[PDB]
Design a protein around this ligand. Structure first.
Ligand SMILES: OC[C@H]1O[C@@H](O[C@@H]2[C@@H](O)[C@H](O)O[C@H](CO)[C@H]2O)[C@H](O)[C@@H](O)[C@@H]1O
Ligand SMILES: OC[C@H]1O[C@@H](O[C@@H]2[C@@H](O)[C@H](O)O[C@H](CO)[C@H]2O)[C@H](O)[C@@H](O)[C@@H]1O
Length: 266
C-alpha cells in the first residue's frame, strides 16, 4: 500500500515551526501509504533543510517548492536555494517547483517569471535537478512553458462549485487543457483534494463521505492514464480556519480520520 499515493502535500505552520524530530514523526505515520512528500517554501521555518534531513533518515523522496509572491521573496528564496546546495545532499529530490499560482494571483508578469525560472534552472541543472512551476489550467503561457522541464496543475473542482459525482471527471478534463499548452513536455498534478467539513460551495458539499469518494475516484483516474499525482493534503490544518482546515487525509493530531479509507477506486 506504500504505492497508494505517488506523493503527498505537507503543510507547515509559520507561527509554530517544527523540528527535525517532529518532521520525522510526521513522515513516519505516512510511510505505510506513500514514500514521497512535498514542501511549499524553502526559507520559511527553514523547512526545506529540515525535511531533507527527515526524508533521508527515513529512506523517502521529496519535491521542493519555492514560495514567491512579494518582490523580496524572489531574493530570499534564491539565497536559501544556494545555501541548500552547499549544505545538503540533494540526491533524493525529484523536482523543484518554482512558485505556486503566481500568475493566478497576479504577483508578477509572464516575462518576469520566465526570467526567474531561467536563472533557477542554470543553478540546479548541473546538480541534476529538474524544474517546474505550478498553476491553474488556464495559466500556462508559452513564454513560461519554454523554460520548464515539466508542468504541474493545481485544480480544485470544489472551488468551482462542481457536484461530487462530476468532480473527478472535471479534473481530468482540466488536465487535457494543460496538455494542450504543454509544448509536448510532461504534465503532472501538483495539487487536488476535497474538504470533510465546513459547509458547502454552491452545489459542492463538504463531508467525510464526499472526501472519501473524491480520494477513491482521483486515485483510479490517474492510475488508468499513468499520471503522477501529489494529493492535498497530509493532515488537517486548524490554523487556516473554516473549510481550509479540513483537507487532510489524516487528522491534525496525526490520528486517522473516521470514515476515510485509504485505497484507490480501481
Ligand atoms: O508559508 C508559506 C506561504 O504559504 C501559503 O499558503 C500555502 C497555500 O498556498 C497552499 O495551497 O497550501 C499550503 C499548505 O497548506 C500553504 O502553505 C500562504 O498563503 C502564504 O502567505 C505563505 O507565505
Ligand atoms: O479561494 C481561492 C482558491 O482558488 C483556487 O483556484 C481555483 C482552482 O483550484 C479551480 O480548479 O478553478 C477555479 C477557477 O475556475 C479557481 O478559483 C486555488 O486553487 C486555491 O489555492 C485558492 O485558495
Amino acid at each position: 500500500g506504500s504505492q497508494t499515493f505517488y506523493g503527498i502535500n505537507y503543510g507547515v505552520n509559520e507561527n509554530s515551526c517544527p523540528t527535525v524530530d517532529s518532521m520525522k514523526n510526521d513522515f513516519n505515520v505516512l510511510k505505510p501509504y506513500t514514500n514521497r512528500v512535498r514542501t511549499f517554501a524553502l526559507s520559511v521555518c527553514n523547512q526545506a533543510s529540515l525535511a531533507l534531513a527527515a526524508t533521508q533518515a527515513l529512506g523517502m523522496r521529496i519535491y521542493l517548492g519555492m514560495w514567491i509572491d512579494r518582490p523580496d521573496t524572489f531574493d530570499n528564496e534564491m539565497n536559501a536555494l544556494k545555501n541548500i546546495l552547499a549544505n545538503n545532499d540533494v540526491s533524493n529530490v525529484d523536482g523543484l517547483i518554482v512558485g505556486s499560482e503566481v500568475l493566478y494571483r497576479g504577483d508578477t508578469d509572464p516575462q518576469s517569471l520566465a526570467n526567474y525560472i531561467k536563472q533557477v534552472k542554470e543553478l540546479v541543472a548541473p546538480h541534476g535537478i529538474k524544474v517546474a512551476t505550478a498553476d491553474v489550467y488556464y495559466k500556462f503561457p508559452e513564454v513560461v512553458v519554454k523554460e520548464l522541464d515539466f508542468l504541474m496543475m493545481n485544480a480544485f473542482p470544489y472551488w468551482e462549485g462542481v457536484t461530487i459525482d462530476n468532480a473527478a471527471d472535471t479534473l481530468m478534463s482540466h488536465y487535457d487543457q494543460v496538455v494542450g499548452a504543454s509544448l509536448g513536455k510532461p504534465v503532472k498534478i501538483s495539487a487536488t483534494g476535497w474538504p470533510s467539513a465546513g459547509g458547502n460551495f454552491q452545489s459542492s458539499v463538504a463531508s467525510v463521505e464526499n472526501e472519501n469518494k473524491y480520494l477513491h475516484d482521483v486515485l483510479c483516474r490517474v492510475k488508468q492514464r499513468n499520471i503522477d499525482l501529489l494529493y492535498f493534503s497530509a493532515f488537517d490544518e486548524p490554523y487556516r480556519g473554516g473549510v481550509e482546515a479540513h483537507f487532510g487525509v489524516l487528522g491534525s493530531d496525526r490520528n486517522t480520520k473516521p470514515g476515510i479509507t485509504i485505497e484507490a477506486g480501481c
